[PDB]
């Protein structure tokens, strides 16, 4: 059963084992059951923590239903893979990734008064060879000020930094003037769409190149895992993979009554159904009731 | 697909481009006289203008029946297509069994025959471990949990450095 | 038995989702009571 905060996260979700939890709840409200009152409680810390642990119950089955585009040629299987993660994060309640990491910067550094503190409280979320490349620019601009640069914007010393911080961002490859003119808007919507269509060709070149960099790491992890495995004899592999299957059944068979472990062994029995159903008719595949 | 679509017998395909399907439709102003033939079978019915519009009323919603998951199959398919590239260079190995005769035995230096009989025993080591295709399913499960924990991010599943850098210049170069 | 379903077969099997749920059922009631009993 659900606690109604799960079933509100599973309404716009699309995966299987959540939508059969929604369809079983939507059939119960139809049969004369009353809907629970949604609690207007658990102030800002518990409210943003339940969002962390309810969106991860939408992301986690959703990531497993997204086929990686490994060993593929072209940019369209990466634009498929990234768009499946865009539409997955939207079903889990996330916003656009540009909107969601810019929210992460202003959350970490609401009280950062110096530019060296905003470069060290948003350190985990910026590429480290870009964060370091903004420290040679911060140390160069610190020479002509000889005082700490403040996070003001109206300060002239911040404009001396942002004259050379923008100089890195174009050299990194990202058009900072098309980013900044997108999030500022424009007056007329005709020239607001000339910057919208140049932000979204950066952004589509942005979300692809790190969806592709996520694939090329899985391609290089699977090729180093396989080439470590092709060097073994076949008898070593058969007993190494039989102990790992035994110790991980045993970890789920010791934990009894837990929800995850009794759902784990229903997956082992459903894997064995797939092998048993293919073994009965292998030119057609598994048998679906249809 | 959306709830309302706007396609059917208007700029439709009237002729097939293959030979295994020969399709010809007769575009009446109201209806369409279709005739499709595939080998020995012939089907010639009639569809209306409003009968193609009700087709997209209920959606098919094709979904994949995978053994473990769709993610896991995409890693195992890559390991299978990697295990084929290594099988292809075990296919170009020279036939050592054409030199198993005793007229190659007794002509050869005895240490260069131990090396040759161990180079043949190494091929059967390499060939029996690259055709162990039942081992590739449990290899793809060593790639899944590190990948799925990267997608279980606190920012976004689809976030990476290039988006987060370009959203840092929007954050930094605006006034705090 | 045989010939199960489609919506039973579409679920990805060994995803976590119930470790995340088991943590969220043991973290949330154990931290809802922490915020209502907190003085420095």
């Amino acid at each position: 059963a659900v606690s109604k905060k799960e079933v509100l996260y599973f309404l716009s979700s699309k995966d299987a084992e959540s939508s059969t939890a929604v369809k079983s709840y939507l059939k119960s409200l139809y049969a004369g059951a009353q809907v629970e009152a949604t609690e207007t409680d658990a102030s800002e810390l518990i409210a943003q923590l339940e969002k962390k642990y309810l969106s991860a119950q939408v992301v986690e089955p959703g990531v497993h239903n997204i086929a990686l585009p490994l060993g593929e040629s072209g940019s369209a299987p990466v634009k498929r893979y990234a768009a499946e993660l865009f539409n997955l994060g939207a079903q889990a309640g996330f916003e656009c990734p540009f909107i969601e990491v810019s929210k992460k910067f202003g959350q970490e550094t609401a009280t950062s008064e110096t530019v060296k503190d905003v470069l060290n409280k948003t350190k985990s979320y910026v590429s480290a060879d870009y964060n370091a490349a903004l420290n040679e620019v911060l140390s160069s601009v610190e020479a002509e000020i000889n005082g700490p640069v403040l996070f003001d914007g109206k300060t002239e010393g911040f404009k001396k930094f942002a004259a050379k911080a923008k100089a890195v961002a174009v050299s990194r490859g990202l058009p900072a003037d098309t980013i900044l003119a997108y999030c500022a808007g424009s007056a007329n919507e005709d020239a607001a769409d000339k910057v919208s269509k140049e932000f979204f060709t950066w952004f589509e070149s942005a979300y692809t190149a790190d969806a592709a960099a996520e694939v090329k790491a899985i391609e290089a992890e699977a090729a180093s895992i396989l080439d470590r495995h092709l060097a073994k004899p076949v008898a070593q592999i058969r007993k190494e993979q039989a102990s790992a299957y035994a110790s991980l059944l045993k970890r789920a068979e010791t934990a009894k009554g837990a929800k995850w472990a009794e759902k784990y062994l229903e997956d082992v029995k459903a894997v064995q159904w797939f092998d048993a159903s293919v073994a009965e008719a292998p030119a057609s595949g598994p048998k679906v009731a249809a | 697909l959306t709830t309302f679509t706007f396609s059917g017998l208007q700029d439709a395909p009237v002729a097939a481009l293959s030979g295994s399907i020969k399709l010809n439709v007769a575009a009446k102003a109201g209806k369409a006289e279709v005739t499709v033939a595939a080998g020995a079978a012939k089907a010639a019915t009639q569809v209306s203008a409003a009968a193609l519009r009700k087709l997209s009323g209920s959606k098919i919603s094709l979904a994949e029946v995978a053994r473990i998951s769709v993610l896991h199959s995409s890693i195992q398919n890559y390991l299978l297509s990697l295990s084929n590239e290594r099988y292809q260079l075990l296919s170009q190995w020279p036939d050592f069994t054409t030199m198993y005769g005793k007229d190659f035995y007794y002509r050869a230096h005895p240490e260069d025959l131990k090396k040759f009989y161990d180079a043949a025993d190494e091929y059967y080591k390499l060939y029996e471990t690259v055709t162990e295709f039942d081992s590739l399913s449990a290899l793809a499960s060593q790639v899944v949990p590190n990948y799925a924990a990267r997608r279980r991010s606190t920012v976004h599943p689809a976030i990476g450095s290039t988006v987060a850098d370009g959203a840092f210049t929007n954050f930094l170069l605006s006034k705090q | 038995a045989d010939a199960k379903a489609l919506d039973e077969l579409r679920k990805p099997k060994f995803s976590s989702k119930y470790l995340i749920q088991h943590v969220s059922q043991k973290l949330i009631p154990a931290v809802k009571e922490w915020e209502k009993s907190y003085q420095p």
Binding site: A223 | R152 | H22
Partner: peptide, 30 residues
Amino acid sequence: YLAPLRSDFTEEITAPKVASASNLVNEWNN
């Protein structure tokens, strides 16, 4: 075929650490 379940989150946004190419394609050619 089955993997250990993890319930943990990624706090950082990092590059995905492309591993090094193994030597197996040329040592099997040796």
